[PDB]
């Protein structure tokens, strides 16, 4: 009740009334009202990172959020937060940064009190116990154990080779060894450390809150003033440190790191002082816009033209409060690693060429106009994630610009541009090279993660080759942008309008699905395409030239369309199994120009030979490093291969890259674009005549340049799914080569897509959503990766289980069967009211309107590419869902999912590691020693008839 805001800055497109305030204990509180919301939410941000751990015990803040979800004194049940939140269509999650920790949830229509008081007890008074500390560190061990092979090792190696007396050189996760094994090796208690950590830091003023309410902006202000008033200010000042961790002994240095997956990268690290205080001029975003910018005559395009560099991201990377980095991070080609000194020479060539002319007024004016237009039409936000974001930046800004963060800029002061532009000098460089060519050359190794590297401090030869004489190459500044938008007129709703996209064109070449946007009224309209070809996936060779051609098209068109991607017009062009794909979205004004240029660059396409010879190798080293990936990800991929009519392995395509040559690929594009068929939806703010004009220009350009003919309707076909026998127990194991964990995915297949049988599997997969997490991970501690839900491929729906762990996989499959039996025992015991609570939770989870325009375009397109065309399946299906009995779910269970079931279909994939409470009797498994033979002797399901 200290401070109340009158009205703050909001974009005039929004309708959500706001209110900011501050409580008696110095908590920054933000209030969001929404009359038409459907899932309310709230969040919190304690301004304490993992950079305030004590030196003896490492990773208390992460272990503390990880231990805080379980158990309070006003609710002694272990899961009452998670159980009540999952009974009401909600989900809770949290993480720790180096500086702060986010706590956030979302909840159903009006259940604010019964979940806010549960989220509040979180900080009022928490209670832990022996059990939780005993079975929680195993999940934190799996947490570290998934990242011991994760190359995102480079982070801790940047943390390591700095100032070892500095608080930046600290470890965030804990690996069961620093958390558990060290403190009882020397008798240090953990619970006292946790109560001291929490009572010292977390309970103070530091945290800020935000709540996304439905009712009013006065109904809930008196609600949050009586509900978070207990947490008491301990007057803790914010931890900060003016001394940057990089002292001059470890500057001007060039390490050499060895990865696990075959990559080649070059990191150029500069230290700069703090520029978070200057959030109005933002010099770092200016230099990020001028250094890391692809296009005509810029830093990237010359290194492309010399064959050294694939891509390079510039910008300024944040750090702690006292210091801040500046990075130009590059990737490398095969012969890019020979010329690193010349690469960084060109980088200082472009720096000095941007230092000779310095500041520019019109680049600032352009960027400020672009951020103002990008702020004025900010699309709608999902209420979970958004309040965590706007609680996550609430510590820095006053009440008026809580929203207008990195969108509005007031002044262009070139003096700070010159300050940050002088700190980029080759006496401030720290080069870091990552290459798998350093197998036997590394002296030093990391203890925490186990990576190997060197110390080659650069002698002054190459320093006084960098800064000696720097006139120019052929660089220039970027020119005037032409994809900036000017037409912002919402076209009036057509007299004939449809709530669902309607077939408007139907020819043997194409078909359309069109809807003018009725809900959102934003001057932007996405549009996407699905081209079909029977020659795109015929054999590995024809499934492999497709990615090479398509990729080189994106390569040769980035130079053109990066200004469109910077102005607000984004495209995406990738391949699919059946044919290729296209999706162009963004502001409504410059869609034609872009789509047209994409088509005429698609059909009339030549091949630059050195670019092809680079991309071929950059794909050959992107196939064969699939073996260095998760065991359970191998398991999901393995199931797809054995459960589809045709699929080719990752060993086939890298075998058939020993045949792709320039003339072969060069004759392939006239074979792919000779006969084809187009399917598309157009969505957003467009008239119907302009929709027919869009498809007209598209198919007329393909007619004009490609000599495209329509396909016969008998060769518009899909793939089918193998039908398992009425009684089945299929399994075959493979061995992950580089990960020390095991993994498993087991598949229970029911049936085809019906309107009376999707609610059986969906309700049974909602009745086991919370218990499966609690029994497998919270209790039995089978690992960190627990997931169980409906899988739908080729229409045929099945319920699966994804779980990967240290344990041997058949132990997992037995304890899954035990969970099934215990689950049906808990189902037959449950009362009517909890069953109607689960039905209401699924009737709220599924009957939920999308907020963003792409969130309904991905609702329409994702079913139009499945050839079912059922747009009203969100209403009628859930109108059938309301009339179900507990007995009907038990019927679904007995003959389909049970162990004694007559109609029981089950296939299993075991991925095991490098060196590998009453379970029931299980039938002897049948081993699949050959994938093709297994598919041959089995029938295939029929395809789904359209609506």
């Amino acid at each position: 009740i200290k401070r109340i805001g009158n009205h703050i800055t909001k974009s005039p497109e929004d309708k959500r009334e706001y209110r900011g305030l501050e409580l008696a204990n110095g908590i920054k509180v933000l209030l969001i009202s929404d009359p038409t919301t459907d899932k309310s939410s709230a969040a919190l941000d304690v301004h304490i990172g993992s950079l305030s751990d004590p030196p003896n015990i490492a990773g208390l803040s992460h272990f503390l959020e990880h231990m805080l979800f379980l158990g309070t004194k006003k609710y002694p049940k272990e899961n009452e937060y998670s159980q009540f939140l999952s009974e009401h269509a909600g989900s809770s999650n949290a993480f720790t940064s180096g500086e702060h920790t986010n706590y956030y949830f979302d909840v159903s229509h009006e259940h604010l009190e019964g979940a806010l008081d549960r989220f509040a007890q979180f900080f009022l008074s928490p209670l832990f116990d022996e059990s939780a500390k005993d079975r929680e560190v195993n999940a934190v061990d799996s947490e570290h154990e998934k990242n011991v092979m994760n190359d995102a090792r480079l982070f801790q190696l940047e943390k390591a080779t700095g100032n070892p007396k500095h608080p930046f050189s600290k470890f965030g996760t804990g690996n069961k060894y620093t958390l558990e094994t060290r403190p009882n090796q020397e008798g240090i208690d953990v619970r006292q450390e946790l109560l001291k950590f929490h009572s010292a830091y977390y309970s103070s003023n530091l945290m800020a809150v935000v709540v996304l309410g439905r009712e009013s902006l006065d109904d809930l202000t008196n609600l949050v003033v009586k509900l978070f008033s207990e947490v008491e200010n301990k007057n803790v000042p914010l931890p900060e440190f003016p001394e940057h961790p990089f002292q001059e002994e470890h500057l001007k240095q060039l390490y050499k790191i060895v990865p696990i997956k075959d990559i080649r990268n070059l990191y150029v690290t500069f230290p700069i002082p703090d520029l978070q205080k200057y959030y109005k001029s933002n010099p770092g975003h200016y230099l990020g816009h001028l250094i890391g910018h692809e296009g005509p005559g810029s830093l990237l395009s010359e290194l492309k033209s010399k064959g050294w560099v694939n891509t390079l991201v510039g910008g300024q990377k944040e750090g702690a409060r006292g210091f801040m980095f500046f990075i130009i991070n590059v990737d490398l080609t095969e012969e890019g690693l020979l010329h690193v000194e010349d690469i960084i020479l060109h980088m200082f060539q472009y720096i000095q060429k941007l230092r000779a002319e310095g500041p520019q007024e019109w680049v600032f004016q352009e960027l400020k106009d672009l951020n103002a237009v990008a702020f004025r039409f900010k699309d709608k936000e999902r209420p979970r994630g958004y309040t965590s974001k706007i609680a996550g930046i609430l510590h820095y800004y006053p009440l008026e610009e809580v929203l207008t963060a990195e969108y509005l800029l007031e002044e262009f002061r070139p003096d700070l541009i010159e300050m940050v532009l002088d700190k980029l000098r080759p006496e401030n460089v720290r080069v870091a090279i990552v290459s798998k060519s350093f197998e036997g050359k590394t002296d030093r190794t990391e203890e925490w993660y186990g990576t190997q590297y060197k110390q080659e401090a650069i002698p002054d030869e190459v320093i006084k080759k960098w800064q000696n004489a720097d006139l120019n190459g052929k660089f220039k500044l970027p020119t005037k942008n032409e994809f900036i938008p000017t037409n912002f007129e919402i076209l009036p709703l057509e007299k004939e309008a449809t709530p669902y996209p309607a077939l408007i064109k139907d020819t043997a070449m194409s078909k359309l699905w069109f809807k003018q946007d009725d809900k959102f009224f934003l001057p932007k309209a996405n549009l996407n395409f699905e081209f079909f070809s029977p020659f795109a996936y015929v054999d590995p060779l024809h499934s492999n030239m497709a990615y090479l051609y398509l990729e080189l098209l994106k390569d040769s068109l980035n130079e053109y369309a990066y200004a469109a991607e910077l102005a607000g017009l984004s495209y995406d062009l990738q391949n699919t199994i059946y044919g290729m794909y296209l999706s162009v979205k963004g502001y409504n004004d410059k869609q034609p120009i872009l789509l047209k240029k994409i088509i005429e660059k698609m059909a009339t396409f030549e091949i630059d030979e050195k670019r092809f010879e680079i991309i071929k190798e950059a794909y050959m080293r992107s196939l064969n490093n699939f073996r260095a990936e998760q065991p359970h990800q191998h398991a999901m991929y393995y199931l797809r291969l054995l459960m589809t009519e045709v699929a080719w392995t990752k060993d086939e395509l890298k075998e058939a890259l020993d045949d792709v040559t320039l003339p072969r690929l060069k004759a392939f594009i006239p074979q792919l674009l000779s006969r084809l068929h187009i399917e598309a939806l157009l969505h957003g703010n467009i008239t119907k005549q302009a929709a027919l004009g869009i498809m007209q220009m598209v198919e007329d350009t393909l007619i004009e340049h490609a000599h495209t003919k329509p396909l016969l309707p008998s060769q518009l076909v899909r793939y089918r799914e193998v039908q398992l026998p009425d009684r089945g127990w299929f399994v075959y194991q493979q061995r992950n080569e580089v990960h020390n964990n095991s993994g498993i995915e087991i598949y229970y297949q029911t049936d085809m897509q019906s309107t009376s049988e999707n609610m059986f599997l969906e309700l049974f997969a909602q009745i086991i959503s919370e218990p499966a997490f609690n029994t497998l991970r919270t209790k039995e501690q089978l690992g960190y990766i627990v997931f169980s839900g409906p899988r739908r491929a080729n229409g045929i729906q099945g319920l699966r289980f994804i779980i990967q762990s240290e344990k041997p996989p058949h132990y997992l499959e037995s304890r899954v069967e035990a969970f099934l039996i215990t689950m049906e025992k808990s189902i037959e015991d449950m009362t009517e009211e909890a069953f109607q609570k689960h039905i209401q939770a699924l009737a709220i989870r599924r009957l939920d309107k999308p907020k963003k325009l792409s969130a309904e375009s991905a609702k329409y397109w994702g079913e139009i590419i499945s050839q079912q065309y059922n747009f009203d399946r969100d209403n009628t299906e859930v109108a059938y869902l309301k009339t179900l009995t507990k007995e009907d779910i038990i019927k679904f269970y007995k003959e389909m999912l049970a162990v004694d079931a007559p109609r029981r279909h089950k296939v299993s994939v075991h991925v095991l590691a490098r060196e590998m409470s009453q379970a029931p009797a299980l039938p002897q498994p049948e081993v699949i020693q050959n994938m093709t033979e297994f598919k041959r002797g089995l029938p295939l399901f029929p395809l789904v008839k359209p609506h």
Binding site: S50, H62, E65, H66, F69, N93, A94, F95, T96, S97, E143, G172, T173, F773, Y784, I785, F787
Partner: peptide, 8 residues
């Protein structure tokens, strides 16, 4: 980036 319950 140390999320709880992973994702998906």
């Amino acid at each position: 980036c140390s999320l709880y319950q992973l994702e998906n």
